[PDB]
Amino acid sequence: MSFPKGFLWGAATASYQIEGAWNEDGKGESIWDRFTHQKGNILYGHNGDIACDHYHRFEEDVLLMKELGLKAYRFSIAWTRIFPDGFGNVNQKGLEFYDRLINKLVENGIEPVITIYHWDLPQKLQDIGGWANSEIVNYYFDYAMLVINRYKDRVKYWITFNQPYCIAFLGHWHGVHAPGIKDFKVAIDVVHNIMLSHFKVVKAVKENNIDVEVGITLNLTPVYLQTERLGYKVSEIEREMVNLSSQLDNELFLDPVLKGNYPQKLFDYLVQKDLLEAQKALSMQQEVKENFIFPDFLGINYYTRAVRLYDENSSWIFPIRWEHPAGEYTEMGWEVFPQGLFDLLMWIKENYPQIPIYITENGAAYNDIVTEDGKVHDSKRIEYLKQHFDQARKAIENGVDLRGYFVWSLMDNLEWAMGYTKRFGIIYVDYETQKRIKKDSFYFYQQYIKENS
């Protein structure tokens, strides 16, 4: 069973994680510039001031992509490089960088896939409440339409948002991501404003007859029951409560994007527990129904699963706990579970309308060391990729409309609050010299693309 003709074998990055040049050429301050410049937020006080210096070295990086034989390259645009203040003055030097990057990609036969928002909100917009302020929808819209209109001739695939779960909950509930806010109700407001922002862009692309594909990227976590792993009888309350908990991860974002409503079971529970105001629940349902429009593709970020069970006295917002099955784990503490990719894809196929699917991120963090001969023998990363590739092939064989696969990541980069301590690249980056070293996984992926295209 072969991968389809034209399958987009890719690699992915995000602007804040690789670009550096955080205050060059009139670039405004982002919430991640602010967050990493405050003590106690990032391991080892790492920041994205320099990162992989991709802003200056993009030409050499594109050459590595060509050598690799990528069909596509997924990256994000830094809003603050285009509108330093979020709205108003457009920065010509910002636009010129992405002009040069995109042209270089096109010259090398690589399909650009652009994430419009990958977490780096302008701090000036955060100053007025960021994603919690419904004015953000229009500011985002103007930014998105500017870049789409400028690049639509060279860029066919656009992703409105990457991982709304993180933007909302990690950014505004747990506060482990920028902007570091800790309020569940604010986080739900953010979810809603993201959905409206997304819908507005999809609508404008259709209504203005812009010939591009617009999607959104969600991290999805397939949830499994510890009780079933153990062979016990599953109680009704357990199944119900674990289902609720997994709706927070998955359905809360899939349902509005693909069906035009929020999951009602989740909302009923959140209102009952005074985690969501009854009025807001009704308004959110109505506004999403009014503005809903089906997208052109679904982007899925997949890394691992979760195993859960009922626990009446848990400190989580649902009475559930997590369990840790035996097996292999990455430096992130994430279970290596390729089967979860297959189960997830089949579950999307069976429970949602037909839609093309791209795996916009999948990869693994291992503690790479460079040998004396200047190599990186990341055989565990290779095994991780090989097994997930195989599950993707199996999903295709079972009728999933999978159209691409982007490895996270093209190169080692700043892993947000974990700093540079987590290496996901198929290319090693020595942060002292900015040298790029092709890992063994680079050559494995190169070969894999060659024999599956």
Task: Return residues touching ligand BGC (CB under 6 A).
Answer: 14, 162-163, 219, 301, 361, 408, 415
Nearest approach in angstroms of CB 115 to ligand BGC is 9
Residue nearer to ligand BGC on the CB measure, 217 or 226: 217
Alpha-carbon torsion, ordered 208, 209, 213, 216, to 10 deg: 20
Nearest approach in angstroms of CB 359 to ligand BGC is 11
Contact 125, 139 (CB under 8 A): yes
Residues contacting residue 22 through CB under 8 Å, at least 6 positions apart? 30, 33, 47, 48, 49, 50
Nearest approach in angstroms of CB 43 to ligand BGC is 13
Nearest approach in angstroms of CB 176 to ligand BGC is 11
Nearest approach in angstroms of CB 312 to ligand BGC is 31
Residue nearer to ligand BGC on the CB measure, 160 or 162: 162
Contact 121, 131 (CB under 8 A): yes
Residue type at 321? R
Nearest approach in angstroms of CB 300 to ligand BGC is 10
Residue nearer to ligand BGC on the CB measure, 250 or 301: 301
Q: Which residues pair with 438 in a beta bridge?
A: 427
Contact 297, 403 (CB under 8 A): yes
Residue (of 305, 306, 307, 312) closest to 235 by Cα position: 312
Given the structure tokens 């990958």, which residue do they identify?
Answer: 118
Residue nearer to ligand BGC on the CB measure, 389 or 420: 420
Nearest approach in angstroms of CB 164 to ligand BGC is 11
- After which residues does the chain break, using C–N > 2.5 Å? none
Residue (of 337, 331, 332) closest to 307 by Cα position: 337
The values of phi and psi at residue 12, to 5°, are: -130, 150
Residue (of 320, 442, 335, 435) closest to 378 by Cα position: 442
Residue nearer to ligand BGC on the CB measure, 222 or 319: 222
On the question of a cis peptide bond just before residue 134, with omega within 30 degrees of 0, the verdict is no
Residue nearer to ligand BGC on the CB measure, 66 or 380: 380
Residue nearer to ligand BGC on the CB measure, 157 or 310: 157
The values of phi and psi at residue 327, to 5°, are: 150, -160
**Which residue has its beta carbon closest to ligand BGC?**
301
Contact 112, 102 (CB under 8 A): yes
Residue nearer to ligand BGC on the CB measure, 30 or 162: 162
Nearest approach in angstroms of CB 231 to ligand BGC is 33
Distance between CA atoms of residues 30 and 85, nearest Å: 9
